[PDB]
Symmetry: C3
Amino acid sequence: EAAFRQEGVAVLLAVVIACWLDVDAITRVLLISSVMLVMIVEILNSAIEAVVDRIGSEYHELSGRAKDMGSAAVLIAIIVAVITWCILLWSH
Amino acid sequence: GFTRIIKAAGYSWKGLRAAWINEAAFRQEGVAVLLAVVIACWLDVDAITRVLLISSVMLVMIVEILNSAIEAVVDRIGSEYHELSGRAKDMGSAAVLIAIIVAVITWCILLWSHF
Amino acid sequence: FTRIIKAAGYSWKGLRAAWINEAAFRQEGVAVLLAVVIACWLDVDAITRVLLISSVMLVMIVEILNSAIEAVVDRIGSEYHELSGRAKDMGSAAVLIAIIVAVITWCILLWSHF
């Protein structure tokens, strides 16, 4: 997957970066586990899109709403990543 | 390259708002979540703890959206097939419940620590 | 308020379902309750107790979601050959990532404290 390697890249980079920076163990944990929250959610979204692909041919509100919601969940996870990193790095 | 990102954002918006309008059980949690966040922001506390209360709340949020996705799928199957197990929606609901339990407990312990 | 108590009932039946139907759910259950109790035995910074437990419960929630996905795949591929075993595989992968997070979190935190 193309974009899963885009966020894969974003996640591994974010992790490595969060490790190079000397930071409180708790805070390294928070950064890492935040970006990993994003990771897990994305894999779940992959699973959903897999099931939506398995069943049905046509567009439905029922069928599109699902994938749309998955994408939304991913977006929320990333918002959490952004905000978490923001507040923690601001705390300094 | 950058177009894909904005398309994803768009789908995210249409799906988040689909989640909002097509469900009235997602708004109780919406209110509870935004309120919990705001409240967690006007109280004085260390940044790490802000991060924690808020992220517990948002864990609940994300899980809820996923549950919405599952129920959409089951709606799709229930259209095609005739009988529904209903074991999927139940477990989604269970996941949400666990997330909220985490919220409650997290807030409990943190607020006990500080106060 | 009953519109909430019905949801609680559904959570309970769906959890007795997740528990009993999956003969494997119980394992991660043991690991998680043990991890929680142990993390409560240890005298730690409230924040850190919260984090340990949060990692563990993250694993829990992800696991339940995976059970949900598995149920869906069951209803579908009852008699049908599937190009969607990858769905369940992704689920299992998500669980694995959650547990990796648990392991790493506990590692770093206990290293810090000790």
